[PDB]
Scaffold this active site. Structure first.
Site, mmCIF file in Angstrom:
data_model
loop_
_atom_site.group_PDB
_atom_site.id
_atom_site.type_symbol
_atom_site.label_atom_id
_atom_site.label_comp_id
_atom_site.label_asym_id
_atom_site.label_seq_id
_atom_site.Cartn_x
_atom_site.Cartn_y
_atom_site.Cartn_z
ATOM 1 N N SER A 180 0.872 -1.166 0.000
ATOM 2 C CA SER A 180 0.000 0.000 0.000
ATOM 3 C C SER A 180 0.916 1.226 0.000
ATOM 4 O O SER A 180 1.914 1.273 0.727
ATOM 5 C CB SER A 180 -0.975 -0.092 1.180
ATOM 6 O OG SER A 180 -1.685 1.125 1.278
ATOM 7 N N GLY A 181 0.648 2.198 -0.841
ATOM 8 C CA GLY A 181 1.528 3.350 -0.870
ATOM 9 C C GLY A 181 2.630 3.112 -1.824
ATOM 10 O O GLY A 181 3.359 4.024 -2.045
ATOM 11 N N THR A 185 -1.656 2.207 -8.221
ATOM 12 C CA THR A 185 -2.767 2.909 -8.806
ATOM 13 C C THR A 185 -2.304 4.040 -9.678
ATOM 14 O O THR A 185 -2.741 4.285 -10.786
ATOM 15 C CB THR A 185 -3.665 3.346 -7.694
ATOM 16 O OG1 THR A 185 -4.234 2.164 -7.179
ATOM 17 C CG2 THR A 185 -4.769 4.182 -8.314
ATOM 18 N N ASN A 227 -1.514 5.343 3.156
ATOM 19 C CA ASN A 227 -1.753 6.039 1.922
ATOM 20 C C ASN A 227 -2.987 6.851 2.048
ATOM 21 O O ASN A 227 -4.069 6.337 2.382
ATOM 22 C CB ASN A 227 -1.859 4.946 0.731
ATOM 23 C CG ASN A 227 -2.087 5.443 -0.715
ATOM 24 O OD1 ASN A 227 -2.180 6.690 -0.925
ATOM 25 N ND2 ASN A 227 -2.193 4.456 -1.700
ATOM 26 N N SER A 230 -5.633 5.264 -0.406
ATOM 27 C CA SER A 230 -5.550 3.802 -0.511
ATOM 28 C C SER A 230 -6.713 3.146 -1.272
ATOM 29 O O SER A 230 -7.903 3.501 -1.087
ATOM 30 C CB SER A 230 -5.265 3.126 0.809
ATOM 31 O OG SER A 230 -5.143 1.724 0.685
ATOM 32 N N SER A 231 -6.342 2.211 -2.184
ATOM 33 C CA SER A 231 -7.391 1.519 -2.901
ATOM 34 C C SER A 231 -7.856 0.442 -1.935
ATOM 35 O O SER A 231 -7.026 -0.358 -1.516
ATOM 36 C CB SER A 231 -6.752 0.804 -4.100
ATOM 37 O OG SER A 231 -6.035 1.739 -4.917
ATOM 38 N N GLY A 451 0.244 -6.880 -3.347
ATOM 39 C CA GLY A 451 1.117 -7.996 -3.374
ATOM 40 C C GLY A 451 0.884 -8.707 -2.012
ATOM 41 O O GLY A 451 -0.180 -8.482 -1.454
ATOM 42 N N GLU A 453 0.470 -9.697 1.762
ATOM 43 C CA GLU A 453 0.186 -8.844 2.897
ATOM 44 C C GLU A 453 0.570 -9.577 4.193
ATOM 45 O O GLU A 453 0.003 -10.637 4.563
ATOM 46 C CB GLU A 453 -1.325 -8.574 2.914
ATOM 47 C CG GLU A 453 -1.902 -7.437 2.028
ATOM 48 C CD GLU A 453 -3.357 -7.081 2.289
ATOM 49 O OE1 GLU A 453 -4.171 -7.739 2.907
ATOM 50 O OE2 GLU A 453 -3.710 -5.942 1.781
HETATM 51 MG MG LIG Z 1 -3.888 1.764 -5.062
#
Ligand SMILES: [Mg+2]
Length: 740
Positions: A180-181, A185, A227, A230-231, A451, A453
């Site tokens: 994340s981060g 995206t 993030n 974050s998605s 990826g 976690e």
């Molecule tokens: Mg994302």
């Protein structure tokens, strides 16, 4: 041609700066170095020690402080010669050890070069600051250029994929994963931007495709401590083309949306952007009609302590969101109802249950309840009853039960989550209706998902995402295998399953199968499930580990290392239950969107199969599509855990490289003939080393063999290939280290 103009931004921003001379002599030095851990008080921390002596079996080198240390040759992490600092592909390094790898990336990062290839991968390190390399002008340079012709870049791989598609008449995919981060995206938005420009019809569609993402980001992204944007869902985007290579459509598949964030966020975190967007952005008039107030007024937004994101204007974002909705094609009616749904969910969250009377719940005040019903277009009395007194089947009997507060709240929460997840699904489906073409010739699909976690606490969702990642890494591994064999053939030269099965095996049953099994029984508990799991795999399956003391966890040995999962609420997560009475209530909504969320079986239901079985099914479809494409791999990496620029942390970085397959790929490669150079390329640089060869000879191979011969190099160390000379690990560096 910016590519040839050393003064262009192309040059400033994407390349190592080149000075006047190119000559070999420039990089000459007597010094030989080694990478060492100045303390096994670290292990990703290394320092460069200069070899001051050696024995037939080990080296001796000076430390930074000045202390002499000794090393086994076979254990030395040799430093590549200076000339290699900065190379665009790690495959070009002679010495391929970890510290060596990290060093090349760092040297690049220090010059703001965030993209570097590693063999088949494009490695992308978040700079955490804006680098102006994604302008139209930069888009243009990448047109039609080969990998080897331009600097590493997300545009470059996008181009390579578009050309492959056109040339091979084969669908392609770009798998963009990492933490994340990390920039997944962002890089995904760039892939689409690139494609829309190189293949767009100089346009409504393109505009629509582009505006789809902002819509989805408003409802599926949120600020987390990792993030600001974050998605909270994964996605597979198919960019569709006709046979002439023009964009003809697109489709989106979403996965694992974090519905729980709707009802709870950790400290400093935010709920999904939309909620903030509508509240800041709604018109003083819309608010009145929505019963809106400030965030502080809603339990679903007032717990985390953060209602705002630094440098973000929710009101302005709302405008962008509504715009996208307009472009894509959402009717204002539809738009009002979407907002109604958001508003409604917030009202549901402000519903307070009280007890006393007995053990059962009641609603003394009903304002919230009423606001929610108004917006939803359902009956408040029907609502109230479905929340606190749902009719439950007792086999023959269909009797209403009076839930207590807890149970009552939980139910409400479930209602919210169903509403949120279904709405999201509906949004995706609507977007697909507009964009998608049943008539496509080719596609280039982009997967932007996390990826592996491994958090402090790992749960059902983690197991899912890690299961996907086991399959993707195995997909990679298989591919690297083909491609590498191919390579060798063209020139004329020379564990996942187990983890996978443990998870999705059918007979013997794996974790998900046992989970489904327990899911059939109303009375099963966390304890029943974990015991079952241990029962089948503790000391019995090599990738499983029952903990020494915890009674609620279990470990899985994953590609990336062991992950411990906790079982709490898994049964519930597997069924994702929603009281039938609530389904009934909502099925009668007078809202036009609402009704779809409960009366369209494609949104309101799974099949029914459990959450696990659906996930396994979706993942197999995905893999199946992927298997039909020519894949491209982008590993995005975060430089540190603070979201700061100019701070590339070795441990943070190496750990991602160990988990995402980059170091393993290299391990594999290093063993054979990692170095492979075009004959002429070789001579151009090494001609001066042999009392014989002309920089620009016409018998490039001969020329090669000449130098080699001069140097008395060990024939075992290299391989005469059809177009390139193949060199084993280290050879090339020694060659480089040669006198002129
Ligand atoms: Mg994302």
């Amino acid at each position: 041609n910016p590519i040839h103009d050393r003064t262009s931004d192309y040059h400033k921003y994407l390349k190592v700066k080149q000075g006047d001379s190119d000559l070999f002599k420039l990089t000459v030095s007597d010094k030989r170095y080694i990478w060492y851990n100045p303390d096994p008080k670290e292990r990703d921390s290394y320092e460069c020690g200069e070899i001051v002596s050696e024995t037939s079996d080990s080296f001796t080198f000076k430390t930074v402080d000045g202390q002499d240390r000794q090393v086994k040759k076979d254990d030395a992490n040799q430093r590549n010669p200076i000339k290699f600092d900065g190379v665009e592909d790690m495959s070009e390094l002679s010495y391929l050890n970890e510290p060596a790898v990290f060093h090349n990336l760092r040297v690049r990062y220090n010059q703001d070069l965030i993209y570097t290839y590693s063999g088949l991968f494009l490695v992308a390190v978040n700079p955490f600051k804006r680098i102006p390399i994604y302008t139209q002008e930069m888009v243009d340079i990448f047109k039609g250029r080969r990998r080897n012709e331009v600097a590493p870049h997300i545009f470059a791989i996008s181009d390579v994929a578009y050309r492959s598609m056109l040339d091979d008449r084969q669908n392609q995919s770009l798998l963009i994963t990492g933490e994340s981060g990390a920039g997944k995206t962002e890089n995904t938005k760039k892939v689409i931007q690139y494609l829309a420009s190189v293949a767009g019809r100089n346009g409504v569609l393109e505009q629509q495709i582009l505006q789809a993402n902002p819509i989805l980001e408003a409802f599926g992204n949120a600020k987390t401590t990792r993030n600001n944007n974050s998605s909270r869902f994964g996605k597979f985007i198919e960019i569709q083309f006709n046979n002439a290579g023009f964009i003809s459509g697109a489709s989106i598949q979403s996965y694992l949306l974090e519905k729980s964030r709707v009802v709870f966020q950790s400290e400093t975190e935010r709920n999904y952007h939309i909620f903030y967007q509508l509240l800041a952005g709604a018109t003083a008039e819309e608010k009145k009609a929505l019963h809106l107030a400030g965030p502080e007024s809603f339990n679903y937004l007032n717990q985390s302590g953060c209602v705002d994101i630094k440098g973000v204007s929710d009101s302005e974002e709302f405008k962008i969101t509504r715009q996208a909705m307009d472009i894509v094609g959402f009717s204002q009616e539809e738009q009002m109802s979407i907002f109604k749904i958001i508003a409604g969910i917030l009202h549901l969250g402000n519903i307070k249950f009280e007890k006393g009377a007995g053990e059962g719940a009641v609603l003394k005040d009903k304002t919230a309840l009423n606001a929610a019903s108004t917006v939803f277009g359902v009956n408040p009395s029907v609502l109230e009853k479905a929340l606190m007194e749902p009719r439950i089947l007792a086999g023959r009997d269909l009797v209403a039960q009076h839930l207590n507060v807890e149970k009552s709240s939980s139910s409400r929460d479930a209602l919210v989550k169903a509403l949120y997840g279904r709405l999201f699904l509906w949004l995706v489906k609507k977007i697909n209706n507009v964009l998608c073409q049943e008539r496509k010739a080719y596609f280039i699909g982009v997967l932007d998902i996390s990826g592996f976690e491994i958090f402090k606490v790992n749960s059902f969702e983690q197991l899912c995402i890690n299961y996907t990642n086991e399959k993707l890494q195995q997909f990679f591994n298989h591919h690297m295998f083909k491609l590498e064999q191919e390579e060798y053939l063209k020139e004329k030269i020379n564990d996942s399953q187990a983890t996978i099965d443990l998870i999705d095996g059918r007979q013997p049953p794996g974790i998900l199968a046992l989970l489904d099994e327990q899911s059939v029984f109303p009375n099963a508990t966390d304890n029943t499930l974990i015991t079952k799991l241990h029962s089948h795999f503790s000391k019995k399956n090599a990738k499983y580990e029952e903990p020494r003391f915890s009674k609620t966890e279990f470990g899985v040995t994953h590609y990336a290392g062991q992950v411990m999962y906790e079982i709490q609420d898994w049964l519930e997560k597997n069924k994702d239950p929603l009281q039938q009475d609530l389904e009934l209530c909502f099925k009668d909504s007078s809202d036009n969107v609402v009704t779809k969320l409960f009366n369209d079986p494609n949104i309101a239901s799974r099949a029914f199969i459990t959450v696990a079985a659906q996930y396994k099914e979706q993942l197999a479809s995905l893999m199946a599509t992927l298997e039909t494409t020519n894949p491209h791999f982008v590993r995005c990496i975060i430089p540190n855990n603070k979201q700061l620029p100019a701070k590339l942390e070795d441990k943070v970085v190496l750990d991602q490289l160990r988990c995402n397959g980059v170091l393993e790929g290299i391990r594999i490669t290093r063993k054979g003939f990692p170095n492979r150079i075009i004959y002429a390329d070789f001579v151009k640089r090494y001609y001066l080393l042999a009392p014989n060869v002309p920089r620009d000879a016409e018998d490039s191979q001969k020329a090669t063999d000449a130098v080699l011969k001069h140097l008395n190099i060990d024939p075992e160390q290299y391989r005469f290939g059809i177009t390139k000379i193949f060199f084993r690990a280290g050879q090339l560096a020694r060659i480089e280290e040669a006198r002129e």
